[PDB]
Amino acid sequence: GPDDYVPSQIAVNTSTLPGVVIYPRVIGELAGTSNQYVFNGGAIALMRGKFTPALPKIGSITYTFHQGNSRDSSDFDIYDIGVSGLGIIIGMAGYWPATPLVPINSSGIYIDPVGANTNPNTYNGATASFGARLFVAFVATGRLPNGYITIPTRQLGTILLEAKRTSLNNKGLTAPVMLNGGRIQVQ
């Protein structure tokens, strides 16, 4: 069917965090991930994605990612992943490389096109897919002990698919945004 878009997740991997050697402060960036087909399957459409955080907000911090097209600094919300002394911040963007990193500092924001945040009629150009880029950074909220800290898998939030044509917009299709657990080495 023309509106038979089906979701697929976007995730970052804890294992990509370098070894922490050192409040609150950023202790490292996970590898940025990309998925051109977070929503795929239907016919060509004008589409946009809205991210909704799923984790409690425990603080805020200024930061600039080294990975994405991040020119200025921004306010990020520190989210709780249920690990003492730790927190994470999120930044998202459209799949295409020129798009800007969208810091997550609210309960809802359009990650692509970023213009939809200031114009409710704005969608991406006609395409048969919607994708995203995911950036995550670990934050130490307090002095961390040396060793291996376990990080559980947590759903960081959800991308909601909106489209110009009402039938696809009415489906309200969503896809999950994931942090894949593992361990981090503090020294």
Numbering used by the authors: 21 to 42, 50 to 214
Q: What does the report in the manuscript say about this coordinate set?
A:
Ucl fimbriae are attachment organelles that facilitate ExPEC adherence. Ucl fimbriae are phylogenetically related to Uca fimbriae from Proteus mirabilis and F17/G fimbriae from enterotoxigenic E. coli (ETEC). Tip adhesins are two-domain proteins; they possess a C-terminal pilin domain that connects the adhesin to the main fimbrial shaft, and an N-terminal lectin domain that mediates attachment to specific ligands, therefore dictating host range and tissue tropism.
Next, we determined the crystal structure of UclDLD from F11 at 2.2 Å resolution. At the time of collecting our data, there was no structural model with sufficient sequence identity available in the PDB. Thus, we used iodide SAD phasing, using a sodium iodide derivative of UclDLD that diffracted to 2.85 Å resolution, to obtain phase information. The final UclDLD and UcaDLD models contain residues 21–215 and 21–217, respectively. Electron density was not observed for residues 43–48 (UclDLD) and 44–47 (UcaDLD), suggesting that these regions have a disordered or flexible conformation in the crystals. As expected from the high sequence identity, the two structures are similar, with r.m.s.d. of 0.6 Å for 189 equivalent Cα atoms. UclDLD and UcaDLD have a completely conserved pocket in the same region of the structure as the N-acetylglucosamine (GlcNAc)-binding site in F17G. Of the 358 glycan structures present on the array, UclDLD bound specifically to four glycans. Overall, SPR analyses revealed the strongest binding interaction occurred between UclDLD and sialyllacto-N-fucopentose VI (KD = 11.72 nM ± 3.6). In particular, the swap of asparagine 192 in UcaDLD to a positively charged lysine residue in UclDLD could be the reason for the increased binding affinity for sialyllacto-N-fucopentose VI via its negatively charged sialic acid.
